[PDB]
Design a protein around this nucleic acid. Structure first.
Lengths: 112, 104, 107, 98
DNA sequence: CATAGGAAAACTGAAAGGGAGAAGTGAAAGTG
DNA sequence: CACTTTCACTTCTCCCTTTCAGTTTTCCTATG
């Protein structure tokens, strides 16, 4: 099925409802707020799949093909943040990215 | 009954005021505005009504086609001596419209 | 009706009235266009020279009727060249610190 | 929002920051005092950008020094010409516009 | 212990930059 | 006539990405 580029919010809601990425989850019964893992790239404990969502999105649009392009976790993170930053209907609700243990951010759908 | 002519039909729809944003724009009623929102806009007239008046569109029978309604309306108006396009505000993000004037 | 952008361009290159808008070969088929990034702290009106000249040619921009919108000028100049048979972008140096420009060729 | 280098030439030409000076004639070389403060042009910068508002914020002179050294670090056409931050007497560093 | 200092590189918001491609246009052929 | 469609273009909206110009974090060693 000749897919059009998915749009970031519809796509991401998928990822939330389906729960297949570790630490990317709805955080409440009403499915209104959600968490995103958000570890800093200079951290020594950091890997690839630390930040799956950023990579996942770079791949959902065709921007990064594993093995064709050089991996660039900084660029993925910044594209994702950037895309969501433009979205009426969405806000950054809680920045816990400097946490030494479960660094993440919480976002919240806001009804128009 | 026969086909309406665009100019008297147009005048009649401006008079009746049943179409939102379609209105005389001065006191002497020789200038007027037509809503002119660009079709690629999510939030997306008289264009349709003229398609309905002329038999070019029947709801049910036809697939809607705002682009062709707008194009036909515009080209029909371009031809008319005695009517000029006075102002193009079709890009404005709040009330995209154009302003015509009956002249002679 | 709107001018076509490619004949207007040759005309503009020949007149040679815009800084860094030039033929860069003898046969006049290769030309350069300045392309500095708007966000650069040394940017102004004539950093968008052919872009404005083009918005004025098509009547989009009337200095005094309209407010400058250089991203839109640049947007529409680039869009008008965007997939044009007969022109290709030979070289993107819009990123150069020194003289950001792009090189285009007639094909 | 002020740009660091135009801003810095403007602090140097104005000469009203203790120990921050043109050290040259062609005005292309300059000093900035660099004491290991462990018991100001760095705060000047932090206030100029809104990073620090005295009263709203906890004073943080190491961060201010950090942000200021890191900004200058990124500018092409500025060079650290002499590091005398480890001189016992007048701890300072010398930069040079190139 | 404690904090301050460094360079390198990751990070950030705001705004410019980009591309795809549907829809926009006037002039003039076409339609009955 | 009296519009409607075709042709040969340009440009606009959607919907993100990337640059700009610093700013922070990391992971350390030095200093107090």
């Amino acid at each position: 099925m000749g897919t059009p580029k998915p749009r970031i919010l519809p796509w991401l809601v998928s990822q939330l409802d389906l729960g297949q990425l570790e630490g990317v989850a709805w955080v409440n019964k009403s499915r209104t707020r959600f968490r995103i893992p958000w570890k800093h790239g200079l951290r020594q404990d950091a890997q690839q799949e630390d930040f799956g969502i950023f990579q996942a999105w770079a791949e959902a649009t065709g921007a990064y093909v594993p093995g064709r392009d050089k991996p660039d976790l900084p660029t993925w993170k910044r594209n994702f943040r950037s895309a969501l930053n433009r979205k009426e209907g969405l806000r950054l609700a809680e920045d816990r990215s400097k946490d030494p243990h479960d660094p993440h951010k919480i976002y919240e759908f806001v009804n128009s």
